[PDB]
Each structure stands twice: as C-alpha cells, then as structure tokens.
Amino acid sequence: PINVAIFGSTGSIGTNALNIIRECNKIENVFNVKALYVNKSVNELYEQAREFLPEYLCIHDKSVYEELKELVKNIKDYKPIILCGDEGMKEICSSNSIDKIVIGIDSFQGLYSTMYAIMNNKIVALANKESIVSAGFFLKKLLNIHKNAKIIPVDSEHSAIFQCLDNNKVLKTKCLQDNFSKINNINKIFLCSSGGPFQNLTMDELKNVTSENALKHPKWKMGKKITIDSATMMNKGLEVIETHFLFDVDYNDIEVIVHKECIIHSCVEFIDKSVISQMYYPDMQIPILYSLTWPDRIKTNLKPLDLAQVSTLTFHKPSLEHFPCIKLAYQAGIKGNFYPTVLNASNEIANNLFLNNKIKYFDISSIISQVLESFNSQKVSENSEDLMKQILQIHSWAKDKATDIYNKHN
Amino acid sequence: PINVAIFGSTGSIGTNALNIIRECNKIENVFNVKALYVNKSVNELYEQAREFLPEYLCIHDKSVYEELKELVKNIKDYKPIILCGDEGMKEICSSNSIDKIVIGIDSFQGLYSTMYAIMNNKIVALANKESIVSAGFFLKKLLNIHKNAKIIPVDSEHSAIFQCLDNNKVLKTKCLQDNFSKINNINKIFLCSSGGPFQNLTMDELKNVTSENALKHPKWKMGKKITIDSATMMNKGLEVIETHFLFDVDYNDIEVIVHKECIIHSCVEFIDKSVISQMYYPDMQIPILYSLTWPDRIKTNLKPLDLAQVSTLTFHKPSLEHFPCIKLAYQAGIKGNFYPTVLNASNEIANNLFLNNKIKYFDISSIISQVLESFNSQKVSENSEDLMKQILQIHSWAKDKATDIYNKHN
Ligand SMILES: COc1cccc(CCC[C@H](CC(=O)N(C)O)CP(=O)(O)O)c1
Ligand SMILES: COc1cccc(CCC[C@H](CC(=O)N(C)O)CP(=O)(O)O)c1
Ligand SMILES: [Mn+2]
Ligand SMILES: [Mn+2]
Numbered sequence: 001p002i003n004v005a006i007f008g009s010t011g012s013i014g015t016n017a018l019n020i021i022r023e024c025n026k027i028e029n030v031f032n033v034k035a036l037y038v039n040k041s042v043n044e045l046y047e048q049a050r051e052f053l054p055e056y057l058c059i060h061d062k063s064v065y066e067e068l069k070e071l072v073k074n075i076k077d078y079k080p081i082i083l084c085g086d087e088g089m090k091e092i093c094s095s096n097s098i099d100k101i102v103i104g105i106d107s108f109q110g111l112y113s114t115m116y117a118i119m120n121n122k123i124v125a126l127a128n129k130e131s132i133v134s135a136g137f138f139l140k141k142l143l144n145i146h147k148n149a150k151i152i153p154v155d156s157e158h159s160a161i162f163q164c165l166d167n168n169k170v171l172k173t174k175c176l177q178d179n180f181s182k183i184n185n186i187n188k189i190f191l192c193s194s195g196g197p198f199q200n201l202t203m204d205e206l207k208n209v210t211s212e213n214a215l216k217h218p219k220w221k222m223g224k225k226i227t228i229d230s231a232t233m234m235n236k237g238l239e240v241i242e243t244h245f246l247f248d249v250d251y252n253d254i255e256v257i258v259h260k261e262c263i264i265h266s267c268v269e270f271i272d273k274s275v276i277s278q279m280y281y282p283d284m285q286i287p288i289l290y291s292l293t294w295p296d297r298i299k300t301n302l303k304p305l306d307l308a309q310v311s312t313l314t315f316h317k318p319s320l321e322h323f324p325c326i327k328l329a330y331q332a333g334i335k336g337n338f339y340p341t342v343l344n345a346s347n348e349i350a351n352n353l354f355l356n357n358k359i360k361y362f363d364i365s366s367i368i369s370q371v372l373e374s375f376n377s378q379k380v381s382e383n384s385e386d387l388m389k390q391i392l393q394i395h396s397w398a399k400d401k402a403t404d405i406y407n408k409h410n
Numbered sequence: 411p412i413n414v415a416i417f418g419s420t421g422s423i424g425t426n427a428l429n430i431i432r433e434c435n436k437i438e439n440v441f442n443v444k445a446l447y448v449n450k451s452v453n454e455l456y457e458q459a460r461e462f463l464p465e466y467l468c469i470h471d472k473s474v475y476e477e478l479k480e481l482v483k484n485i486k487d488y489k490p491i492i493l494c495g496d497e498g499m500k501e502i503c504s505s506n507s508i509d510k511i512v513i514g515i516d517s518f519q520g521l522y523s524t525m526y527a528i529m530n531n532k533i534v535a536l537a538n539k540e541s542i543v544s545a546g547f548f549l550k551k552l553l554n555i556h557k558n559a560k561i562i563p564v565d566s567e568h569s570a571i572f573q574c575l576d577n578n579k580v581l582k583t584k585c586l587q588d589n590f591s592k593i594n595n596i597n598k599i600f601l602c603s604s605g606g607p608f609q610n611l612t613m614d615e616l617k618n619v620t621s622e623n624a625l626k627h628p629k630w631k632m633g634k635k636i637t638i639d640s641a642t643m644m645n646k647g648l649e650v651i652e653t654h655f656l657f658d659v660d661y662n663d664i665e666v667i668v669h670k671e672c673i674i675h676s677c678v679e680f681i682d683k684s685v686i687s688q689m690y691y692p693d694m695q696i697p698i699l700y701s702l703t704w705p706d707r708i709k710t711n712l713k714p715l716d717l718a719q720v721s722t723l724t725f726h727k728p729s730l731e732h733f734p735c736i737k738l739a740y741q742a743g744i745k746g747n748f749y750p751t752v753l754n755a756s757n758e759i760a761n762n763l764f765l766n767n768k769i770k771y772f773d774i775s776s777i778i779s780q781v782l783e784s785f786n787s788q789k790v791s792e793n794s795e796d797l798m799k800q801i802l803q804i805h806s807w808a809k810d811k812a813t814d815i816y817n818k819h820n
Contacts, residue, residue: 167578275689302683
C-alpha cells in the first residue's frame with residue numbers, strides 16, 4: 001500500500017493526481033491518500049477529504065482554519081489531524097505514515113515544502129520545474145546529505161526520459177546526482193516541444209503578437225504562465241536546464257525538437273546510439289502515476305494509444321532567431337553559476353509583463369538578456385543555509401533588475 | 411571480456427556481428443571472438459581467422475577441411491583448434507571458454523546449433539525466427555531443463571521489444587518462460603513492419619506480381635527467402651508467432667503496424683497504457699550488439715539518429731485481404747499445437763515455388779491454407795527427444811504435403 005501526500009491538492013497537478021489515484025484504486029487498492037494540503041480552498045478540500053479520508057488535512061490561510069474544522073464534523077466515522085500553515089506542512093513531511101509526496105505548488109512554498117520532504121528522506125514527486133532551475137545547486141547538496149531522499153520527475157518530458165531508462169541502472173544512483181548519465185549509459189537527449197502557437201509565424205508577425213494570441217483556443221488547457229512560456233519556448237528553455245540538473249547531461253548533448261503531435265514525449269539516445277522513447281496521448285495522469293509507482297507500474301483503464309489513428313508524427317528543429325528565449329536558456333545553463341537563477345527570475349517578471357500587455361514579444365527576451373548581462377558570478381556557498389539565502393537574494397535581485405529595466409524604458 | 415562464438419560467420423548476421431565487434435573493440439577491448447563456424451566459404455573464413463584469430467574454427471563441409479588447415483599455417487603465432495561438421499559445432503558449444511553464441515544459420519543447422527547451445531547453458535543470440543516458430547514447444551522445454559541458458563532475441567523487432575523492457579524485471583524471468591509478460595507488466599505489442607515492396611498495390615496488381623518485382627531495387631541487403639516473406643507479409647506473420655513464444659504475449663494483444671520509414675522498430679504498451687519504443691536507422695548492428703551486451707550497453711561510433719532530418723514517421727493498419735499470409739499466421743498461432751510448425755514448413759515450400767516462378771502470389775497463401783486444413787492436432791510428447799522427433803516429422807510431412815498440392819493443381 002503506497003502512502004501518499006498531495007501538496008496543492010486543488011491545483012492542476014493535485015487534482016490530476018487524485019483522479020488517477022481514484023481510478024487505479026477502483027481496479028486494485030494500491031494507494032492510501034494520507035495527507036492533503038491547500039492554500040485557502042476550504043470547500044474543495046472538504047469535498048476531497050470526504051472522498052479520500054486522509055489522516056491529515058492542512059490549509060495555509062489561517063482565517064479559514066476554523067471553517068475547515070467545522071465542515072469535517074459532517075463526515076461519518078472520521079477523525080483527522082487538522083493543521084495549518086508552514087508548521088502543518090512540516091508535521092506532514094515528518095510523519096512516518098507518509099512515503100511519497102507530490103509537490104503541486106509553485107514559487108517559494110513549492111521549494112520550501114520540497115526542502116522539508118527531502119530532509120525527512122521521502123520520495124518527492126516534483127512537478128515544479130522552476131525550483132530545479134533556480135535552486136538546482138541547493139537540491140543537489142540536500143540530496144547528497146539525505147541519502148534516502150529521492151526526487152522523481154513529474155514534468156512530462158522528464159518523466160518520459162526517466163521512463164526510457166533501465167531501472168537496473170537507475171536503482172544504482174538517483175536523480176540530481178553527479179554521474180547519473182554515466183551510470184545509465186546516456187549519450188544524448190531529444191527534448192520534445194509542442195512548439196506552441198507561433199511556429200509558422202514570421203519575425204515581423206512575432207513582433208506584434210499579444211498575450212491574447214498566445215492564450216487563444218489552447219490545444220491543452222493549462223495555466224497562463226506556462227502557456228506564455230510555451231509561446232516563447234522559454235518553457236523548453238527552462239526544461240533544458242531541468243534536464244541538465246535531473247540527469248547530469250551536458251548542454252551540448254540536449255537537443256530541442258519540435259514535435260507538434262505531442263505523442264512522443266521525449267527520447268534518450270544511449271552510448272551505443274540506440275534510442276528509446278516514451279509515448280502516450282498528451283495527458284498528465286501517466287507522468288504523475290509513474291512518479292508514484294516507480295520502479296513498478298500498475299493497471300489503469302486509460303484509453304489505449306491508437307497509432308494507426310494518430311497516423312503521422314513529425315519532427316523539426318526550432319528556429320533560435322524566432323525563439324531567442326531558447327538560446328538565452330542554453331547560454332545561462334552553459335555559463336552555469338547562478339545564471340539559471342537569474343534567467344528564471346527575470347523570465348517570471350517578463351512573462352507577467354507580456355501577459356498584462358505591458359511589453360512586446362521580443363521585449364521578453366530583451367529584458368532577460370539585459371538582466372543576465374547585468375549579473376556577476378558569485379562564489380558558490382559551501383554551507384547549505386548560506387546557499388539557500390544566496391539563491392533567494394539573487395532571485396530577488398533579478399526580479400528587481402527586470403522591473404527597473406521595464407520602468408526606465410517605460 | 412565477452413567471449414563469443416559466431417555460427418554462420420560469413421552470412422548477413424555473421425558479417426554484421428563481426429563488423430560491430432570490430433568497431434566496438436577499437437573503442438575499448440570488450441569482445442574476444444573465440445569461435446567462427448561457416449558452411450562452405452573456406453577463403454572468407456581464412457580472412458576472418460587472420461583478423462580475429464579465434465581459438466576455434468569449424469566448417470560444416472568436410473571436403474574443404476584440409477584446405478583450411480593448410481591456409482591457417484600462413485597466420486603468424488596462431489594454433490587454432492580446427493573442426494568440422496555437427497561434431498565440431500557440438501564441441502564449440504560445450505567449451506567453457508565461450509559465454510555467448512550468435513546463431514546466424516537457418517533451417518536444421520540453426521535449430522540444431524541452438525539446441526546444443528541451450529544444452530550447454532549458454533546465452534544464445536538467436537536470429538533464426540523459423541526455429542522459434544517451428545520448435546517453440548521444444549525450445550521452451552529445453553530452457554526449463556537448462557536453467558542458466560537464455561535466448562536473447564536478435565530479430566530486429568523482437569530486439570526492439572526486449573530493449574523497451576525494464577531489466578530490473580527482465581532479470582527475474584527470461585525469454586520463452588511462462589509469465590514473462592506478467593512479470594514485465596506488458597499489456598500489448600505494436601509489431602512494426604516495413605510493409606514490403608507490394609504494400610501500395612491494388613488487388614489486380616497483386617495478382618500479377620513476380621519474384622523479380624519483389625527482389626528488384628531492394629532498400630537493404632538481405633536474402634531472397636526473407637525478401638519474399640516481406641513481400642507477402644508472411645515475415646510479419648512468422649514474427650507474430652515469434653513474439654507470442656519469446657514474450658508470452660496473447661495473440662489478441664499483438665498488433666501489426668505498417669511503419670514504412672523503418673525508424674521505430676516496435677513498441678510495448680504497459681499495463682498503465684504508457685508506451686515505450688526503440689528507434690534507430692534500419693541497421694542490424696544495434697540488435698546484434700545488444701544481444702551480446704545485455705543487460706549493459708557499450709559505446710559505438712555508429713551514426714547518431716537525426717530525427718529532424720528523418721522528419722516524418724507514419725503508421726497504418728495492413729490489409730488482410732491484400733496480405734492473407736498475416737491472417738493465416740494468426741489462425742495457426744491461435745489454433746496452437748503444431749499448426750505453427752505446419753505454417754512454417756508449408757511456407758518454406760510456397761515461398762520457394764514463388765521465388766522460382768512456379769506459382770502466383772495468391773497461390774502462396776492458398777497452398778499454406780490447404781496444408782493447414784490437412785493437419786490433425788497431435789498429443790504433445792512429454793519427452794524432449796520425442797518432442798524434437800515429432801516436430802521434425804511434422805515439418806517433413808508439411809513440406810511433402812505442400813509439394814504434392816503443387817503437383818496436383820499444377
Ligand atoms: C496536459 O498534458 C500534457 C502532457 C504531455 C504533453 C502535453 C503537451 C504540452 C507540452 C508543454 C507543456 C509542458 O511542459 N508539459 C505538459 O510538461 C508545452 P511546450 O513547452 O510547447 O512543449 C500536455
Ligand atoms: C537491414 O536491417 C534492418 C534493421 C531494421 C529494420 C529493417 C527494415 C526491414 C524489416 C523487415 C526485415 C526484418 O525482419 N528484420 C530487419 O528483422 C522487413 P518487413 O517484414 O517488411 O518488416 C532492416
Ligand atoms: Mn514539460
Ligand atoms: Mn524482423
């Protein structure tokens with residue numbers, strides 16, 4: 001019986017996790033949902049608690065804490081431990097009844113909860129790519145100290161890569177470890193991209209695209225920030241750095257490939273040049289499920305892939321002139337140090353400015369480039385606590401520098 | 411160091427094996443070629459012996475035995491054990507200095523050498539699919555007796571399938587063992603086919619096709635028998651039965667898919683509905699190499715797959731009306747017993763009649779169909795020597811029956 005906590009259970013990752021858990025549990029009792037954690041969605045959490053009956057409930061916002069206590073009195077034969085804030089989150093991570101934690105929260109609370117899950121030697125199913133890009137050095141150090149802790153990737157391309165690896169090799173190492181690629185015989189990665197809504201657009205058309213164009217009739221309905229990142233291909237840029245950190249693959253050995261059908265989710269070339277790929281319909285339930293079942297798989301009732309119906313799969317190179325965010329991501333990754341932290345923070349601001357019609361498409365990459373050029377490399381702190389503060393200071397600095405650049409030109 | 415014997419070293423499989431061994435050994439000394447076995451080509455064997463310097467040389471034809479001995483006196487600092495016939499082959503299989511044996515011979519010598527390899531508890535890299543289709547029951551029985559022997563698939567689609575499996579699971583079972591699919595969490599197989607030279611012909615066009623049409627402007631350098639089987643899609647029919655026996659996959663869970671680009675070599679759907687596939691250029695060096703490195707991989711200098719250049723991958727269902735041999739293979743497999751033995755034997759005759767311009771395209775499937783209808787199921791011998799005799803007698807009967815049907819409706 002797999003004992004799982006869901007952090008951010010009313011978000012997209014959290015609700016997809018509970019859906020696949022429900023469906024798999026109908027086939028065979030595999031999962032025990034031990035904890036649910038949300039920001040402020042009391043009614044939604046109450047409804048989840050009535051179905052899954054977790055041992056723990058937690059809610060960040062303290063003004064709806066007593067409302068939650070009163071709601072759960074309506075549930076028959078059920079006496080949960082009801083907690084609140086960061087202290088509740090810490091108590092959940094330290095519980096001996098929890099084996100695996102799905103991190104479905106963004107920004108700092110994602111990183112903070114990941115930190116606590118690692119400190120308690122848990123399996124961490126991590127969907128927040130920005131935390132790996134920004135704080136990769138810190139997570140790597142924490143994983144070296146807490147030897148039984150593991151990060152298992154949920155980001156679909158990185159789940160795909162992970163699924164292409166031989167678990168007889170994977171089990172000798174773990175993600176975010178030096179020498180991961182060597183142990184797994186990895187030569188090179190094909191990192192698949194949908195390409196977003198702008199692949200056929202000219203440079204002159206790209207000059208005038210708006211956030212409405214990027215968000216209009218999405219093929220897959222996902223959040224605004226990632227949709228804008230998909231449009232600029234900064235999503236893939238961030239994912240290149242994520243690949244480097246998770247799998248210890250050199251930047252020269254990561255190739256972005258535009259695959260508009262989104263059936264092949266990524267591919268791994270091994271040292272003999274054989275290539276393995278993972279395929280399914282574009283659906284987050286498979287990557288989430290594998291993060292919770294690894295190193296095994298369990299039965300689902302998901303729709304089987306019909307390759308004859310799919311019929312055609314296509315691949316092409318992305319144009320770096322048209323999608324300069326990709327180039328900037330590689331440059332930041334290759335330069336190393338805290339340049340990925342700066343890239344991520346400056347993109348957070350630029351993405352949001354574009355979303356709100358404050359800047360143009362190529363201003364996104366212009367601002368990111370300028371902030372990157374404004375940063376000086378820093379000696380990397382050997383001390384774990386100093387290193388986290390260093391990352392947070394640089395993050396804050398880069399957001400401010402991006403905002404100042406905007407303000408001056410405006 | 412991996413100690414290898416090559417049976418049929420001057421055929422297509424043998425020459426590909428020695429090429430990839432040579433190239434891999436230039437990067438790192440991995441392989442010792444301990445034995446080479448050929449039918450007739452004494453001169454070619456001498457040249458191989460001069461380069462590879464194997465401890466054993468064997469030749470099936472006794473009339474060129476003395477010539478080989480005299481030739482080898484030319485090689486400096488070299489004193490091999492020089493053998494001939496079935497006896498020489500048995501002696502090679504029984505050597506404690508040999509770990510892995512590549513079976514690149516067909517027909518009787520192929521089944522015969524496979525048997526002796528298994529009896530001596532070797533790893534057997536098996537490229538002769540006809541042995542598995544005709545003698546699957548016997549090979550299963552033999553592998554149950556000889557617990558440390560293993561068949562590793564070399565046939566490209568079956569190697570692909572094998573490469574899509576997690577070795578943490580594969581190492582708890584072995585090919586041709588009951589429950590192989592259950593242990594590996596296999597739900598379904600996509601068995602990829604080139605479609606062959608007649609794939610786009612109308613029914614009227616198919617009625618007239620000749621063997622010269624099948625053999626003309628061939629895309630890859632392979633033998634006449636398999637080229638004719640590719641044209642009729644009986645190659646894939648045989649490979650369906652091969653999949654069933656190697657992997658214990660039910661016939662209803664094997665789907666033939668026409669993939670004309672021959673980049674994806676086959677795919678495995680797991681019980682969660684995630685699909686894994688193996689990809690490379692159509693080149694037999696990868697499947698051969700993997701059979702000799704499994705459960706590891708080693709470095710090659712093969713050309714890396716350029717997915718952007720490949721650009722497009724396509725998939726469609728084959729027409730059973732145009733390719734009735736596929737339907738016959740499923741029917742024979744599903745019926746079970748020795749019907750696969752009869753299918754293989756009757757196809758051997760019908761393929762050869764068509765190759766030599768004695769019958770038409772649809773006569774191939776007609777003869778096979780009639781022979782299958784003439785066969786009565788038999789009680790399966792419990793004794794392994796009786797079982798081998800039973801298989802061989804059914805094989806002879808079915809070839810004779812096919813020939814007599816040809817002679818009647820001449
Ligand atoms: C909604 O579920 C899925 C599952 C798999 C694939 C897709 C297609 C969308 C792919 C990515 C979003 C992403 O980064 N993901 C999902 O990780 C968009 P781009 O950066 O253009 O490539 C959707
Ligand atoms: C020359 O080497 C390779 C290597 C991989 C793939 C191909 C393409 C030819 C595929 C098969 C032959 C076969 O049965 N093989 C190779 O196992 C033909 P059909 O039955 O139409 O599908 C060639
Ligand atoms: Mn992704
Ligand atoms: Mn084949």
